[PDB]
Symmetry: C2
Subunit: 134 residues, 2 copies
Amino acid sequence: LPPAPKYTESLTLNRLCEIAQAWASMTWEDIDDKQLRALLTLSAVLVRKHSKSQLSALCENHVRREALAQDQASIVLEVYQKLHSDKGGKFEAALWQHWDRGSLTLFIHAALRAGTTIPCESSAIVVASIMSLL
Amino acid sequence: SLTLNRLCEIAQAWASMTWEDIDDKQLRALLTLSAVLVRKHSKSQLSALCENHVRREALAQDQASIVLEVYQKLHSDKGGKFEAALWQHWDRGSLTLFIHAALRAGTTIPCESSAIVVASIMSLL
């Protein structure tokens, strides 16, 4: 336990969140693959900003807003876990090249909706503690 | 509830205000806010926080290691264990300055070290 110390436009966490939420609330009926590829990277990073305790939370926000069968519910949770653990973009890259690009679009979009919408902290006493600052 | 976005709006609102008139109740909540916010950054960016924290505080490199240690131990923390130890062990002033610098640095460093990931995400602004 260590002693106390003795005496334009960057991608801050705040801006990551504003981008993710801005795009999550849009309709994507005109995006090219460059925008989708970037949305994929945004969504993988956004997942990694959540604690893994909350991984399940994202998934089952995702399952409910998209009305998925246990078939895809299982797959969705595994994808969130493989993105949360992803190193060097290996799994992300596999997703981009191998998944059907339209189902990958639906997944990316629902992932941005879940990341900007679930609580980032499960413990209610931490939630109340932080929210007392107003 | 406490989404990532509102966690950030809170941390940014408080980092940019002056705490010359806050009680220990507000400070204790602020320490918790900064531990959560540190945990939102990837572990590779810990050093970035450290260097911002040192440079904005005009701290000797002597202290840099100590500062980085605190960041890592806040980043590791489960059950608020280390957070609690820190709170009761450090004096109010050292703790105020560190928490405040942590809210400035946490809301302002890039959250991603890779320039290609950064350019890709920033193509959507």
